[PDB]
Design an enzyme around this catalytic site. Structure first.
Site, PDB file in Angstrom:
ATOM      1  N   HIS A 139      37.514  57.237  91.789  1.00  0.00           N
ATOM      2  CA  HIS A 139      36.756  57.031  90.559  1.00  0.00           C
ATOM      3  C   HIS A 139      36.464  55.534  90.418  1.00  0.00           C
ATOM      4  CE1 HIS A 139      36.570  56.815  85.978  1.00  0.00           C
ATOM      5  NE2 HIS A 139      37.547  55.923  86.141  1.00  0.00           N
ATOM      6  N   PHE A 140      35.285  55.219  89.895  1.00  0.00           N
ATOM      7  CA  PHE A 140      34.887  53.841  89.591  1.00  0.00           C
ATOM      8  C   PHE A 140      35.140  53.567  88.118  1.00  0.00           C
ATOM      9  CE2 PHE A 140      32.912  49.972  90.969  1.00  0.00           C
ATOM     10  CZ  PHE A 140      32.483  49.445  89.745  1.00  0.00           C
ATOM     11  N   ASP A 141      36.133  52.727  87.779  1.00  0.00           N
ATOM     12  CA  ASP A 141      36.519  52.569  86.403  1.00  0.00           C
ATOM     13  C   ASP A 141      35.727  51.506  85.664  1.00  0.00           C
ATOM     14  OD1 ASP A 141      38.369  53.910  84.634  1.00  0.00           O
ATOM     15  OD2 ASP A 141      39.311  51.917  84.298  1.00  0.00           O
ATOM     16  N   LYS A 150      41.029  52.821  82.116  1.00  0.00           N
ATOM     17  CA  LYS A 150      40.479  52.968  80.783  1.00  0.00           C
ATOM     18  C   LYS A 150      41.041  54.172  80.029  1.00  0.00           C
ATOM     19  CE  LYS A 150      36.184  50.505  81.214  1.00  0.00           C
ATOM     20  NZ  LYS A 150      34.791  50.560  81.696  1.00  0.00           N
ATOM     21  N   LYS A 205      33.070  62.405  97.089  1.00  0.00           N
ATOM     22  CA  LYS A 205      32.271  62.255  95.881  1.00  0.00           C
ATOM     23  C   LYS A 205      32.225  60.773  95.404  1.00  0.00           C
ATOM     24  CE  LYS A 205      31.981  63.686  91.066  1.00  0.00           C
ATOM     25  NZ  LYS A 205      31.804  64.876  90.189  1.00  0.00           N
ATOM     26  N   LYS A 246      22.864  61.138  84.653  1.00  0.00           N
ATOM     27  CA  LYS A 246      24.159  60.450  84.548  1.00  0.00           C
ATOM     28  C   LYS A 246      23.832  59.135  83.863  1.00  0.00           C
ATOM     29  CE  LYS A 246      28.309  58.952  86.758  1.00  0.00           C
ATOM     30  NZ  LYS A 246      29.063  58.617  87.984  1.00  0.00           N
ATOM     31  N   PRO A 247      24.443  58.841  82.705  1.00  0.00           N
ATOM     32  CA  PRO A 247      24.036  57.665  81.884  1.00  0.00           C
ATOM     33  C   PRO A 247      24.301  56.260  82.460  1.00  0.00           C
ATOM     34  CG  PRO A 247      25.218  59.221  80.581  1.00  0.00           C
ATOM     35  CD  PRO A 247      25.377  59.697  81.976  1.00  0.00           C
ATOM     36  N   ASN A 292      26.148  54.232  86.026  1.00  0.00           N
ATOM     37  CA  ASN A 292      26.757  54.365  87.365  1.00  0.00           C
ATOM     38  C   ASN A 292      26.654  53.114  88.192  1.00  0.00           C
ATOM     39  OD1 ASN A 292      27.899  56.450  89.384  1.00  0.00           O
ATOM     40  ND2 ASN A 292      26.265  55.493  90.583  1.00  0.00           N
ATOM     41  N   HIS A 317      29.225  56.089  94.592  1.00  0.00           N
ATOM     42  CA  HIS A 317      29.490  54.653  94.395  1.00  0.00           C
ATOM     43  C   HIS A 317      29.351  53.726  95.555  1.00  0.00           C
ATOM     44  CE1 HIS A 317      30.660  55.606  90.331  1.00  0.00           C
ATOM     45  NE2 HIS A 317      31.590  56.439  90.769  1.00  0.00           N
TER      46      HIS A 317
END
Ligand SMILES: [Cl-]
Ligand SMILES: [Cl-]
Ligand SMILES: [Ir+4]
Ligand SMILES: [Ir+4]
Ligand SMILES: [Ir+4]
Ligand SMILES: [Ir+4]
Length: 124
Positions: free
Chosen positions: A119-121, A66, A7, A41-42, A44, A12
């Protein structure tokens, strides 16, 4: 079902292009990576480096996430990224995005064995 690692790659990774030099890039990519399926998705980010380079960030500078978890890592080098941010007039299902190219350090959360981005922080 889809792994967290897969995912991350879907959401990403875009190693195919060195930079997103189309104003259309986010509109197309957010759609084709299924980021507009159930909602727009707001925000990315896509990363234009090799998968090996991005995976390697999990071994680089450990920084706070975060959300307060401790499993985030900041790339020592800058990377070619594209930021996609939904416009003020965007309305699902016709999700509309502004495309911004940059070169920044990425921050990714890593987990698992093998220890990989999930995850992309942030970018800094
Ligand atoms: Cl499946
Ligand atoms: Cl730098
Ligand atoms: Ir499955
Ligand atoms: Ir694409
Ligand atoms: Ir720097
Ligand atoms: Ir997350």
């Amino acid at each position: 079902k889809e792994t967290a690692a897969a995912k991350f790659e879907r959401q990403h990774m875009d190693s195919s292009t060195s930079a997103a030099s189309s104003s259309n890039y986010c509109n197309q990519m957010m759609k084709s990576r299924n980021l507009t399926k159930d909602r727009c998705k707001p925000v990315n980010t896509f990363v234009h480096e090799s998968l090996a380079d991005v995976q390697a960030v999990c071994s680089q500078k450990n920084v706070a996430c975060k959300n307060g978890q401790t499993n985030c890592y900041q790339s020592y080098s800058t990377m070619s990224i594209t930021d996609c941010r939904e416009t003020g007039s965007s309305k699902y299902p016709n999700c509309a995005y502004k495309t911004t190219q940059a070169n920044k350090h990425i921050i990714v959360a890593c987990e698992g064995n093998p220890y990989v981005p999930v995850h992309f922080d942030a970018s800094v």
